[PDB]
Each structure stands twice: as C-alpha cells, then as structure tokens.
Amino acid sequence: TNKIKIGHVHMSGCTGCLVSLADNNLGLIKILDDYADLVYCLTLADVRHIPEMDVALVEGSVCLQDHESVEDIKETRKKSKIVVALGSCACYGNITRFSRGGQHNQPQHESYLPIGDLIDVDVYIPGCPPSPELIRNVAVMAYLLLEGNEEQKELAGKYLKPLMDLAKRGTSGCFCDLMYDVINQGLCMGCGTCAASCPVHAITLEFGKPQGERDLCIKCGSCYGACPRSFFNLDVISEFENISEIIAKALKD
Amino acid sequence: TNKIKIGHVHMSGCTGCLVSLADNNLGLIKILDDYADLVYCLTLADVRHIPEMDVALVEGSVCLQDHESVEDIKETRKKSKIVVALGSCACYGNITRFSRGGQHNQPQHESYLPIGDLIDVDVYIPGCPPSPELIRNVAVMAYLLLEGNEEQKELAGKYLKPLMDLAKRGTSGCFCDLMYDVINQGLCMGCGTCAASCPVHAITLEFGKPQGERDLCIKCGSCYGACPRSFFNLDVISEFENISEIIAKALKD
Amino acid sequence: MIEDPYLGKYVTCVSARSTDKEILKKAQDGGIATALMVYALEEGFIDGTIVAGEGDKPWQPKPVVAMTREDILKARGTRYNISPQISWLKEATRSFGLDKVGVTGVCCQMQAVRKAQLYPINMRDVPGKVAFTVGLFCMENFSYKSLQSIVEDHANQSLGSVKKMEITKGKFWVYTERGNVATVPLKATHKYEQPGCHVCLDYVSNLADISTGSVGSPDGWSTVFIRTKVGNEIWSKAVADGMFETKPIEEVKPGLDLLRKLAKEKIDKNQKTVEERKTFGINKGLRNPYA
Amino acid sequence: MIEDPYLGKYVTCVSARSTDKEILKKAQDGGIATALMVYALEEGFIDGTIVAGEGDKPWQPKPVVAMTREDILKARGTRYNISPQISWLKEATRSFGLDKVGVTGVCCQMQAVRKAQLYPINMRDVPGKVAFTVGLFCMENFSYKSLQSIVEDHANQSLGSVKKMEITKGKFWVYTERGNVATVPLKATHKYEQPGCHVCLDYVSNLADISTGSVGSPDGWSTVFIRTKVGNEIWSKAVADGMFETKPIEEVKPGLDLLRKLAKEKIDKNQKTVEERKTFGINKGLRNPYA
Amino acid sequence: TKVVEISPTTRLEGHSKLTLKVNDQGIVERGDWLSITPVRGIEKLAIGKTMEQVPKIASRVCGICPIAHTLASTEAMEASIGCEIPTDAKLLRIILHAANRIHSHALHNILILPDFYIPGTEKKFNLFANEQPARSVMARIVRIREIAQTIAAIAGGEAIHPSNPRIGGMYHNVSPRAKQKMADLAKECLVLVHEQMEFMLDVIRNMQNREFVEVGGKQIPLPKKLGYHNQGVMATAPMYGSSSLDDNPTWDFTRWKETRPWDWYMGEVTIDLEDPSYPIGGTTKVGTKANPQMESCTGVPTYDGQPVEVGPRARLATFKNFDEKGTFAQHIARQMEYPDCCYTILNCLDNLNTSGKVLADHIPQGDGSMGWAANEAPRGSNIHLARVKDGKVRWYDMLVPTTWNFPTCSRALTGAPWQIAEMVVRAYDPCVSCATH
Amino acid sequence: QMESCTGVPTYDGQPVEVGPRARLATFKNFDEKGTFAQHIARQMEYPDCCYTILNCLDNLNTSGKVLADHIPQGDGSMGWAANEAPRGSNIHLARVKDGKVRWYDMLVPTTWNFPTCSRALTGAPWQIAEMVVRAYDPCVSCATH
Ligand SMILES: Cc1cc2nc3c(=O)[nH]c(=O)nc-3n(C[C@H](O)[C@H](O)[C@H](O)COP(=O)(O)OP(=O)(O)OC[C@H]3O[C@@H](n4cnc5c(N)ncnc54)[C@H](O)[C@@H]3O)c2cc1C
Ligand SMILES: Cc1cc2nc3c(=O)[nH]c(=O)nc-3n(C[C@H](O)[C@H](O)[C@H](O)COP(=O)(O)OP(=O)(O)OC[C@H]3O[C@@H](n4cnc5c(N)ncnc54)[C@H](O)[C@@H]3O)c2cc1C
Ligand code: NFU
Ligand code: NFU
Ligand code: SF4
Ligand code: SF4
Ligand code: SF4
Ligand code: SF4
Ligand code: SF4
Ligand code: SF4
Ligand code: SF4
Ligand code: SF4
Ligand SMILES: [Fe+3]
Ligand SMILES: [Fe+3]
Ligand SMILES: [Xe]
Ligand SMILES: [Xe]
Ligand SMILES: [Xe]
Ligand SMILES: [Xe]
Ligand SMILES: [Xe]
Ligand SMILES: [Xe]
Ligand SMILES: [Xe]
Ligand SMILES: [Xe]
Ligand SMILES: [Xe]
Ligand SMILES: [Xe]
Ligand SMILES: [Xe]
Ligand SMILES: [Xe]
Ligand SMILES: [Xe]
Ligand SMILES: [Xe]
C-alpha cells in the first residue's frame, strides 16, 4: 500500500504541538519511514505552499484580522481529506481566547477563533501540550482507516469516534466543562483524573469533588477530555491490552 | 378582554427574582388589577398545587436528586403555554453551577441544571438580580401578544424575539461569553456596558477592552445580555421613544 | 419629523455654536456638547452627566460622572481613542445618588443607553433615570497604541506637546501648543482602526436626544440634529435663553449634502462588511448582532 | 480466557490470602492488594504505587505515591469514602521520577487509568509508564459527611474509636478498638450514596490487571481474578515464591455464584438508571458517557 | 536595484518573510527580514490578571522555549514584589533551564543541516532518508532531545509549558530516585552532546572552506564575510540570567528603548524580480506590493539607540571575548554551548537537597514597583518587566531574543546572494512566535 | 429525620428562638412569648431602623476613606461574624489562608428557628399550625443554604 500524505499547518500557535509530535522520537521516524509522507511543514521542509493532503495537522487558532491567515485555513479544508485540530489552541482557542489587541505593531490584530469556527473539523486532538502518545495513536489509526483491511478500518473508526464527537460538540474548553457536563449532570465519581491532567495546577479536589481556580485556568479543554465520565467508549477501552499490542506492533523494528 | 393567568414557580432559587418583580411597586398592582391574575405563588398565596398557566415565571434551577423538584418543572411545562426562565439561576445555573454536594442534611443533593436542560423554555429574563423593568416589560408584552390587536401582537412578538433567541442559544452564562461571542468575533467596540451591568464588579476595561476576574464571576450571563453587540434588534431599539410611551401608557392611572 | 435613511429620524437640523465665550476657548468645534450639559445642569434637566474627562496618560480619556459646571468643561476636545462611557451608567444611580442622568458619547454608546432602557439586563433603575443624551458624530475610533503610533511616528509629534487633534478633509491633523501643525494621510491610518467599528451602521448618532458633529459646518461651528421630545424641549428653551447662535443648515456650506454623502459611505462600506461575515468561512460564518 | 458478562474477561479466579502474617494483622480481608504491591516493589515490577494512605481527619483517605514497603502497609483497610487516586498519576512520572508506576483503587479508577493509556489528554508519559493495576470490588461509595452521618448518628459510634468498617450481609458494620460492634441496615444508608455511583456498570474491577474483593470468600480471605498478561506473570511468580495461600473458587462457599448475583444486581439496577437519563426531561434528556 | 521577496521562510519557527533589494548581480543591497505572525498581544492581555496566571499564559508564547518565558515571567513577578525564593527552588530552575537549552540546540541542528554538506562531498545532508550517515546522526539527536525533555519534565513538571514553577519557587521538590535518574540521564547526555558538538563543528568547518553551495540547481557563491554586521552584541549571563533583585544586575534598563519598525525598516516597494524555481514553490509574484514598516509584526528594541545581536555568540563574545562574527561564527558558538548544559545539571543535582524547601514562607502581594528579570534563553536575552500591585499585573513588557535579532539580522543580509539569504537567517535560530508574542 | 434538609444548631445543647423577639427579650427584657408576642416584637423594630439611618448619615463623611490600607491574606486562623438579620442571628465562621477559604460554616436564623418552632406547635389546632410558623417570618432558602 501507499503511505498517506500528512501536512503540518501552523496558524496562531506556539509550535509546541509540532514539538510534541517530534517527541515520539524513533516512533516518528518509524511512521515517516513506513506509513506517511510529510508533504508540508514550514518548520521542517521548504514546501512554500499548502499542497493536497490526506491528513492535515492544524495547530493554532485563526486571527480574523490577518487576511493571509483566514485564507490559509480555508485553503487547508479545500486541500485535505481529514482535518485535525491539533492541540487546544486549534480545538478550543486556549490562551488566544484572552487576546484583545492593542499591542505593537498590529494593534488591530484582536480576534482569535479556534479553527472549527471557520471550517469543518473531523478530529480533535485536545491538550496543551497535547500528549505525543495521542498524536501517534491518531496518526496510526488514520493510516489503518485508509490503507488497512476492513477489520482495521473498523477498529480505527471506532477508536477515532470520541475524538470526532469532540469536534462536533463545540469549540469551547474550560474548567467549567467539569461543572456543566459532569458534576451538574450527576456523573462525577471523584476519581481525581482532571487534577492530574490540568497543566497549570488549577484543579484541586475538596471532599472528593473538583474545585477550579478559574483565574489560573488557560481554557484548554484538557480536563473534560481526560475525564472518564465525558466520553467512555466501552468497546475500545475494555480492549486496552489488545489495542496496545496492535499499536506497539505498528512501530516495531 | 380577559386577564392572562400568571404563576410564579420557585425551584432552587433565592426568591430575589420574585422580590424584583414586587419592586415594580404600584406598577405590579396596576398589572395585577387590569391585566393578570396570579394563579399560583407559594410565597404570596395558598394555592398548593401548580394550576394551568398562560405564563409561568420559573425562578431557580433544578436539583436532579430531588424527586419532587424534577416533577414540578415537568408539570410546569405541561401546565403552561409560555415558560419564562426568570433570572440567571433559571436561565443559566448562576451560583448553582458551583454546587457539588456533601452538606448536611442531604449530602447527595449534588447536581443542578438550569430549567432549559430539562424542559423547553420560550423566554429568558436574564439577570442576578433581574431588573424589575425587564420583568414588567416582558409581562406587558406577553399580554399584548395574547389579548391585543394584530398591531400589538406584532410589536410584542418582535420585542420578545431576542429574549426568545437567548433561550435557544443555550443554558450557559459567564464572563467568557464576552470573549467567545464578542471580542473573539470582531464585535467589541469598548463601550463599557458590560462593566456597568456586572453585579460583582468582576469586569474592568483595560485599554478599552474587557478584563474579567473569572474567580469573582458568579456565572449569571448578565454581561453578554446587556452587551449592545450580542443582540441589537434595530427594529425595536430605534423606536425607543415610542415603545417607552406605549409601556408607560399601559400602567397609567 | 424627517426620516433620512442615512441621517436617522429628526425634527430639525441647524448649524450652531455656543454664545458662552469661555466654553468656546477649548471646545473642539461649536461647543455644543459642553454647552448642552452645562445648561441642562443649571436648568435642572439633569443632576449629573457622564463625560470623557482627563485621564492618566496624555490624550487618554477617562469617563467620569460630572456634577458641576467646572467638571463638565474639563471634558472639552475630541479624544481619538476609546472611552468606555457606559461603565458608569449604573453607578451614577447608586453611590452618586442621581435622579436625572446625562450621558455623552459616540453613536455606539447612545445605542447601549437605548438598549439598557428597553432591555435592562442587570441594569435596574437605569431605564427611568436616563434623562438626556448628547451624541457625537463618529466615523471610526482608535486604540491608545494606535493614537500613539499615528501621532508620534506618522505625525512625528510629542503627545505632551499636542493641543488639538482633528480628522477632516482626508488627513489626520495634529496641532502643537507652540504653534506647529502636522498631518497624516488617512490611507496610512487604516490599519490602526478598532476592528469593531467596521460593523457600525450609524454616523450622526441616530439614537441620541440631540446629535452634534463637525462635518457640514465651518470651523468653529457645529452641525446639530434635534431628534426626541426631550431634545426639543431642551434645545428650544436654550435658544430662547440665549445659549446659542443658529443658522439654518440649508444656507451653510458644505451643509447637509456633504454630511449625507459621508454617512452613506460609512453605512454602505460597513454594511458590506456585515454581509461578508455571513460567509467568512467555508460552510460557516461569523455572528451578526443585527440578525 | 473466560468472558463473563458480569465478571469481565479473566484467565482464572481463586480464593487467596497472603502468607505474610504482619500484613494480615490489619488487612481488610486477605491482604491481597497490600501483598501484591509490596511484592511488586521488592521484585522490581514497580518502583512506586498510588495507595489510599492516612489523611487528616479520621477515616478520611488521602492518596499518596508510596515507594517503600512501610508506606504501602500504611494504606491497609477499606475507607468508605472517596479517595481521588488518579490525581497523582501524572505526578508520579514527574517529580517522583518513577519508571514503573503501580495504581490501586476501585473500578472507576481502573477505567480512568485505562482511558489515560489509550486517550492521554494532557497525560504525556503516562501510557507507557503504568506498569501494574490492582482493582478492588466496589458496590458504591460515600462522601465523608455521609460516612460521618452513618457512623455517628446511625451506628452511634465515635470515629476516633473505630478500628474497622465493613459492608456485608445487608448491614453496615462498625468495630471499635475497645471491642464493641454496631450495625446499620443498608436501607437506611441509601440516601447517602454518591450519585455518580448510580451509572457505574462495573463491580469486580473489570479493567484491572488483577482484581480482588471480599464477596465469595470466607472472612480473612479474598476473591481474586487474574486478567491481563501482566497480572498473570506477577501472580504466577508470587505463588511460586510462596507469597500466597490459594484454593480454587469452585470449592469455596459462597463462591463465584453469590458474586455473579450481586454483580448482576448492580449492573441491571445502574443500567436502568443510565436508560432513564435519556428521557429524564420533557423532550430532553441527560448526558450518557457511554453513548 | 530590483526587489525579490521570499515568503514564507522555512526551517525556522513561525511565520516570517524576506523582502530584499538586490544589485545587478543578485547580491543584497538592503534586505528586510520581518515577522508576519499575527500579534496575540500577551503583554496587553496580561493587564489586570493575577501574577500567578500571567507566567503560565506567557509560556504559551512558544513551545520550543517555554522554560524561558515561564522563568523570566515568574522572576519578573518575584522581582516586582520583592520575593526571595529558596535555594533548592533555584537549583531546580537551573536544571530545567539547562536541560531546555540542550533540546533547543539539538532541534536547531535538525533545521540547519539540510543546507550543509557531508564534509568533502557535494551531497547535502538528508535526515529524513533511511541512509547513512544521516540516519545514525538523527538517532543521536533524537536521544539527546529525549534525555533533555525527560530531565525537564522531572525538575519542571512538564517538558513543554513547565507546571512546577510558581511565584515563590516550585510546586514540588523531587524524590531521591528522581535525582538519581536525572544524574543518570545527564551522564549519558554528556557523552552524546560531545559527539554531536564535534560532528557539527566539523560540518561547519567544511562549510567555511567551500566557495559555493547549490540552491535549486544553480551554484551560489559563498561570500567570505557572510552575515557580517556592525551592531555588536548584548548578553546577561553565560548560562542562566539576572534580575533586578540582584546586588549587581547584568542588564541596564536605562540603555533600552523600544521603537516601532518605522525607524529601521523599509517603506513601500514593489516586487520586480521573481524566481519560480526557488525550492520549493518560488518567490513572490512580480507586481506584488510590500511595506516592511507596516507589515512587520514586531517592535524594535534597541540598546544605546541601536539594534543588537543576542544569543550564543552574544554570550561568548560578552563573557569569553569570542572574536569571530557572522553566519558560521554564530553556528560555532551555538554548538560550543552543549557541554556547559550537562556539567551545570550535574553540579546542580550534586548540591540539590531533595528534602529542602521549594516555597518561600512569605509571598508579598506587591505595591506597584517595577521589577525585571532576564533569562538567557537558547536564542538570547529574554527580559520581562512587571509592576505587580495587590497580586495583579498592572504593567507588563516582554523583550524577547528573536525580537532583538530581527533588525540586526536584516542588516547582516547585506552582501549575500539573495538565494542564501535564508542561510544568514537560520544562523540566528529564529523563533517568530516568540518575537511577536 | 431523613426528609429535613437542615442541620440543627443548638445553644447550651438546646434549640433556641432567634429574631425580633429574641432581640427585645435579650436587650430590653421583653416579657411576652408566643405567636402574637413575636408579631408585636417585630413591628416595634420599625422606628429604630430609621433613627439609625439618620444618625449614621449625620456622622458619615462622604470624603472619608472606605478601604483599609492593608488587607492581610490570612494564616488559617478562625474568625466569625454575627449579623442580626431581620429573622435573627446570622453567624458565619471562616478560616482564610493565602486569600482562600479553607473552612466555612453558616448558622442562619431560620435554621435556628426550625426545631424551636416545631416545639412551639404543641397545643395548636392543626388548621392554624401555619399561623404559628408565620410568626417566625421563615426563610427556608436561608435555613438550608
Ligand atoms: C472617535 C471620535 C470620532 C469622531 N468622528 C467625527 C466625524 O467623523 N465627523 C464629525 O463631524 N464629528 C466627529 N466627532 C465629533 C467631533 O470631533 C466633536 O467632538 C463633536 O462635534 C463635539 O464637539 P463640541 O465642540 O460640541 O464638544 P466639546 O464642548 O469640545 O465637548 C467634547 C465632548 O466630546 C466627548 N468626548 C470627547 N472624546 C470622546 C471619546 N473618545 N469617546 C466618547 N466621548 C468623547 C466629551 O464627553 C464631550 O461631551 C468624533 C468624536 C470622537 C470621540
Ligand atoms: C467504597 C469501597 C467499596 C467497596 N465495596 C466492596 C463490595 O461491595 N464487595 C467486595 O467484595 N469488596 C468491596 N470493597 C473491597 C474490600 O472492602 C477490600 O477493600 C478489598 O478486598 C481489598 O482488601 P485487601 O485485604 O486485599 O486489602 P488491604 O491489604 O487491606 O489494602 C487496602 C487497599 O484498599 C485501597 N483502598 C482503601 N480504601 C480506598 C478508597 N476509598 N478508595 C480507593 N482505594 C482504597 C488501598 O489503596 C489498598 O491498596 C470496597 C472497597 C471500597 C474502598
Ligand atoms: N530562545 C527562545 Fe524564544 Ni521560542 C525566542 N526568541 C524566547 O525567549
Ligand atoms: N433574615 C434572614 Fe435570612 Ni432570607 C434567614 N433566615 C438570613 O440570614
Ligand atoms: S495547544 Fe499549547 S502547545 Fe499547542 S500551539 Fe496552542 S499554546 Fe502551543
Ligand atoms: S475526572 Fe471527571 S469524574 Fe473524575 S473527579 Fe474529575 S470531573 Fe469528577
Ligand atoms: S482547569 Fe486546567 S485542564 Fe481544565 S480547561 Fe482550565 S487549564 Fe485546562
Ligand atoms: S437569579 Fe439571583 S436573584 Fe434570581 S433566584 Fe437566582 S440567586 Fe436569586
Ligand atoms: S458591552 Fe460589549 S461591545 Fe461594549 S465593552 Fe463590553 S464586550 Fe465590548
Ligand atoms: S462577569 Fe459579572 S455580569 Fe458577566 S457572567 Fe460573571 S458575574 Fe455575570
Ligand atoms: S465607528 Fe461606531 S462602533 Fe466605532 S467608535 Fe464610532 S460610534 Fe462606536
Ligand atoms: S460504585 Fe463505581 S463509580 Fe462509585 S466508587 Fe465504586 S467503582 Fe467508583
Ligand atoms: Fe514585547
Ligand atoms: Fe449551615
Ligand atoms: Xe520540531
Ligand atoms: Xe523533528
Ligand atoms: Xe507525521
Ligand atoms: Xe511531521
Ligand atoms: Xe476521520
Ligand atoms: Xe506522528
Ligand atoms: Xe485521522
Ligand atoms: Xe415578594
Ligand atoms: Xe408583594
Ligand atoms: Xe404578575
Ligand atoms: Xe406575582
Ligand atoms: Xe413567547
Ligand atoms: Xe409583573
Ligand atoms: Xe411572555
């Protein structure tokens, strides 16, 4: 079979999403060797314009007052079969929610939206920083979804489903997700997972229940993501040993 | 014509929404005299059970683990032509977003949702506290929508439209509304109105742009409401002198 | 009651200037906004008014509840950056204890006031205590860093030396206290406009009780629209009391024809901008507060 | 590889208890959870493990990363209120510098670990450094104020006097250090359960490497399920090394038949609860994390 | 004079472009390298936020060097409020800081080698390719970065956007095992970075001995004084940094003034030279208009009224009187910083007391006084300035290393074949998201 | 015992009545008890409210300072405050450390009155049990909080 064609599109991001991918180490080189061609990535290669892509890893959000930027993200949807919001800036805005303009030398650069507000997004990879393991897993599963037998494209399509459901749920991420859609919903069980995943130590548990420092939270959506009562697809997660073995196989030398 | 039949349904609220209504003073007595019967209100009258209502002013939110409470709010939809979420607890959760259980003598009373999450809501009256003027205006316009000539039911139906659009937009209120749907959208013009309406002084303007103390904000939705770049229905608001004259007429002695 | 589709609904329109010479010494134009609030205070139509007072950096405006003639005059002159006038609208009726609040500002600020009067959202007591609005014409506004960049880089002037600023006749004008003048072509300034001004469809402050501006009248003179019953009672009384020199707008150059043309360009340009938000994306668009 | 639909997927199931007498002195049951982590530490399968250690109020558990035999034993005994075990899952791989993390907890906590391994959302380094999970059976949990109300009002005991607590045979059992015993009917306690336990469809910790509990075995003895390859390598080695007394579950009363029945009641009861959330409202329902 | 424009740049972080005026031979006469990254405005959004939040937001300026913004921002708050952090918190911050310099320099090796030749040949390095020696070189780099990111996560809580720093010190000290593990990793890393350092120095020495390089088919001559400028250098420490809490700060805020691109960049021009063959997609179409004064997205900080170079050569010139300048000098200086990083880590681990305190007993809330902190980030002096009052940021300013290097690199472009203008740029290890913030 | 949504605060081990009669008995030795006594005591509090307001306005300096120059962040010590709310003693207790609330407790007037009113119900026709209740001016949202 053919390797899929993968591009890295960089909007208003910090390149930490790209770095996370590279922090797969030899796993990334195994992927690039056997399953994917990087057709585009301004940081690593000299391809000046957005080619056609099977999978586009888009990082960062969109500044509505930068013409070239609105064009790049429209062009990316046009040129790509699967669009991935890579990281919390692309999924949910993250720190660019806080942008409000007035700084040199473009005081009018004021308004920033996550990509799903301008184009349709197929898969979310939430996190700030996003976990290398997730980016790898999503890349391998995208390859099975496109060049595997029917048994794999079925596995791969079930794995990716909650990440696709997140892209259809909305473009907002915040500590309050855990209130709205978990505690307020009767679903919280006090496991503490949200506290472990928060990257700015904004979450403590008081008497088994989440307490959010909302003026510390940078609005990344990680905690609802990781919460085992947001999505819990029993068909995938109960096969953890098997799916882990498959993934390790796909990277073995 | 007949007076419309109005009820006050009290969920998990503080009765401050009711107090606001009463703070219309003689205007409320004018309304009760000439245009509406209060068929239900546990605070003011002895009617023990929820009768049928033309308009139901529902205050407070719904505790999912109190059986009687889930029943009352379903019963209210069944018994009412127009359902009004009166105040921010009913519209958006407000301080009950923060509830998480563990207090005597019902440690399991844990989860609270705004009413629109359990039943369909026709009109929002946001605020904490909600402004008496708005509750009055909405009550007079509801009467015109039901017992007036076609010229009034047209006026009244256009006035109420943004309050109906808010009920369909969602059940979440927060300072971040001004980021998501105004600043992030290119719409903020720095008028400062949000700062005036915030009831806990959570909002300052820094260089003409909103700055939110998110650990002060009690999640009431007032600031997006009052913002002149959330909804601005030019057909009503440009007729301010006329609509003001009509409203004053309806209460004159 | 005319009903221009670019000048809003109004009773009459004349070209005026205050007869109070001390007020005219630093007024931007004819001194209409200052003279109307001073007179409203002395007569008792208002007991206080929000104005753009002096702030903490040079040429940065700071809203304030003025309650004396002297505090009102402190707000003379146009400041070309944002002054969040409405932030004190509710507080005026609380700690300040006012019964009859005045408000001054540009067109969007008048709209906020009218919205608060009809849809008060946590704005208790405001609808019935707004007593007088005076609205300025406004083509667009800037942030402070924008005004800094225009004045200091493009005009090459020190802000601590500037006595007056004026947009007119296609140029940004800076006047120094020692007597020099500098200009900037308006094409250079277009990157510096506040993005939220690009969806504004109101030029002569349609929703004010009285409206006032510069275009249409000679230097030192204001183009004034009287619009509401409140605007009419106060303006009549003030002319009767000698507060104003008038001249019908028809017998003044450039007059109401130039004004209608600049209003028309603003709405059509911005209306286009409003239309494109709808299809800004691919299968997705941006919000429209007007839908 | 059996595949019970109420007991999950597992290789074998025996009734066991640790041969380490010092560990058995305060173990809740057979001392399986303690003995498996101690042995995993001494053998090198883990270099540390999250356990429910002693906290700051009596009978309040506090999660902690244990890295010595002595710290592990401090977590013996069942605490009937929430211990957010996973809050330290990532920190174990950072400041603590662990390569091979153990985790202990109830069924929902095992699910969090497995979810983090497959969908790490800001959980970098966790998937490949989780090395051993031991899961307890769990019918339901309580908040601290619930456990306070049960013990002090219903059992009428002082928390500072309680040496052990046990839910079994339809009653909540309290044992004091001076020797008394008190019970509460489980019907009385139903208002005090954590509401989020009512949608839980997992009784014997299906997703653990090894699972262990009380039901099915005599007092002082544990019902144990070996499930994953990791669970198998470690359990085999430990029996070989003499760490355990075993007995096939079939030749033990009440044995695997009682267990399957209580598991079945939990899932069916909770599954009904999950189903009703769908129509909880009028034309509206509540979220289902399982959809 | 003609006008050629490369947009976007590649093999650097972020979004910039080169707008070059060239003579009749295609040599730069005056080039402008400018940012076209949209301005997120961190310094303005900071105002009114808590002093705890602002460093965690500023970290998200850049994911290659988040350590630099977390530390410079946190220590600007500590300096404004007068907070002295415990010794064991300082030691963990230095370990975090040196680990991150190792990973950043190694990443930059990946970005610059495609322009370099396998010594003595005419084959350029291709690292992607499963051929030697490229592949065993990529393996060394991958393990260096991995060691570096692991040490960073241990001492810093997270390798990208460290969680452990806080006003007053750190959230956590590390366990005895963590300390052993960082020591073990830094022993392995010291061997590797010595190998990599020697490897890169030989490749650069071979480049200094070439007369031309090949760019999209053509031979491009390699000038002797490639990338020379007369701006001088500015550096605050050979390793860590300096703050206004110090008895003798090594940065003088009285010598700094930030202006707008206005004073140093070119005005409007029109592109009258184009090359569709430039790898890979050609240059800007003829007839396009460009205005670096108005398209540049950064401000121009100056020292004694002039732009300056910052970064690894800035540091070695300031502290050891390193006396070579230009493109290849910059590459050399950067590689020479490899071993110090690992010696520092090991010295710091040796003095660290894992039982010691990491949080100052008292954190004052601030009275509005100005403080500043300089972090010597992988690319140069990173200076944050702050006024904190009642725990809130009332004034904030960031002078980031690539911001300093933009006007200085631009001037360094004179005398270069426009086809290797990008090579002059890459010697600065540019981070355009940083520079713009 | 199980449907009641409040806790039962006690003083010297017993429930107590709070509110306007509680105040007049404590401070003036007001010596009538029960439903109509409670109504009387409450009305007698009308004039003090307006005399207080006027005395306070008279001493108020509108140019004076309203914010303490220094706000300490707290070391975890317990403090409490009692407000004589319209229905009785409202006592909040707190431990604040580093500007955060580490422990909080609220003893609200209608919470105090619940068990005390219950006992007051003895000897009444069940049809006027509600009249006995209304003399306490109950606020059940307060009592439950
Ligand atoms: C951004 C801005 C843009 C404008 N654009 C135009 C235009 O395009 N065409 C035209 O004819 N006129 C425009 N004007 C109005 C004009 O410049 C004069 O200010 C107006 O005629 C009032 O002059 P005056 O002599 O009556 O007022 P004065 O007696 O000089 O009193 C000044 C009034 O201006 C208010 N004010 C000053 N600065 C601000 C500010 N940033 N925000 C809110 N209120 C402020 C003050 O409250 C005060 O009442 C603009 C004003 C502003 C602030
Ligand atoms: C709410 C709860 C409900 C339970 N319900 C049942 C049941 O219905 N039927 C049944 O057979 N068994 C149940 N168990 C398990 C049983 O009570 C024993 O705890 C189990 O068999 C372990 O005993 P042991 O002798 O091997 O462990 P020990 O050697 O005594 O070690 C104790 C283990 O329990 C962990 N632990 C203790 N309290 C908690 C807590 N709140 N949260 C997370 N981890 C904790 C500790 O980390 C430790 O590893 C429950 C346990 C808990 C916490
Ligand atoms: N080194 C570095 Fe950053 Ni990505 C830059 N420039 C900043 O501090
Ligand atoms: N008075 C009164 Fe409240 Ni509505 C009561 N009880 C509280 O403090
Ligand atoms: S999600 Fe975080 S790591 Fe990714 S671009 Fe945004 S700031 Fe950087
Ligand atoms: S991760 Fe989810 S279920 Fe677990 S404590 Fe946090 S909100 Fe509650
Ligand atoms: S609380 Fe922490 S994990 Fe959740 S959205 Fe805020 S920053 Fe992200
Ligand atoms: S919205 Fe505010 S006033 Fe209305 S019930 Fe809720 S807390 Fe009370
Ligand atoms: S009210 Fe709306 S438009 Fe006015 S300053 Fe606030 S968010 Fe901006
Ligand atoms: S900021 Fe203030 S007005 Fe807006 S949602 Fe929060 S509490 Fe309400
Ligand atoms: S152009 Fe319109 S929105 Fe912008 S300041 Fe002027 S009145 Fe306000
Ligand atoms: S019943 Fe289920 S959700 Fe509740 S504690 Fe036990 S394992 Fe967790
Ligand atoms: Fe800066
Ligand atoms: Fe209480
Ligand atoms: Xe990278
Ligand atoms: Xe890479
Ligand atoms: Xe890839
Ligand atoms: Xe890539
Ligand atoms: Xe997909
Ligand atoms: Xe990848
Ligand atoms: Xe994918
Ligand atoms: Xe009321
Ligand atoms: Xe009332
Ligand atoms: Xe009413
Ligand atoms: Xe009412
Ligand atoms: Xe309606
Ligand atoms: Xe009303
Ligand atoms: Xe209505």
Numbering used by the authors:
A (entry chain G), B (entry chain G): 18 to 270
C (entry chain B), D (entry chain B): 1 to 291
E (entry chain A): 2 to 438
F (entry chain A): 294 to 438
Verbatim from the authors:
Here, we employ a bidirectional F420‐reducing [NiFe] hydrogenase from the archaeon Methanosarcina barkeri MS (MbFRH) as a unique model system to yield structural and spectroscopic insights into a scarcely explored reaction intermediate that is the initial target for H2 binding to the active site of the enzyme. Each asymmetric unit contains three subunits, FRH‐A, FRH‐B, and FRH‐G, and a total of four [4Fe4S] clusters as well as a flavin adenine dinucleotide (FAD) cofactor and the [NiFe] active site (detailed below). The FAD and the heterobimetallic [NiFe] center enable the redox conversion of the two substrates, coenzyme F420 and H2, respectively, while the [4Fe4S] clusters mediate intramolecular electron transfer (ET) between the two reaction sites. These features are shared with the related [NiFe] hydrogenase from Methanothermobacter marburgensis (Mm), and both enzymes exhibit a dodecameric overall architecture in a spherical shape.2 Compared to the latter enzyme, however, MbFRH contains two additional cofactors that are both ET‐accessible and solvent‐exposed: a [2Fe2S] cluster bridging two FRH‐G subunits and a mononuclear Fe site in FRH‐A.
To further explore the initial interaction of MbFRH with H2, we also investigated possible intramolecular H2 transfer pathways. To this end, MbFRH crystals were derivatized with xenon to explore hydrophobic gas channels connecting the exterior of the enzyme with the [NiFe] active site. These experiments revealed a second H2‐transfer channel that has not been observed in similar studies on other [NiFe] hydrogenases. Surprisingly, the unrelated [NiFeSe] hydrogenase from Desulfovibrio vulgaris Hildenborough features a similar hydrophobic tunnel, indicating analogous developments in certain hydrogenases that operate bidirectionally in vivo. While this narrow channel appears obstructed in crystal structures of other [NiFe] hydrogenases,21a, 21b dynamically enhanced H2 transfer via this route remains as a far‐reaching possibility and a target for future studies.
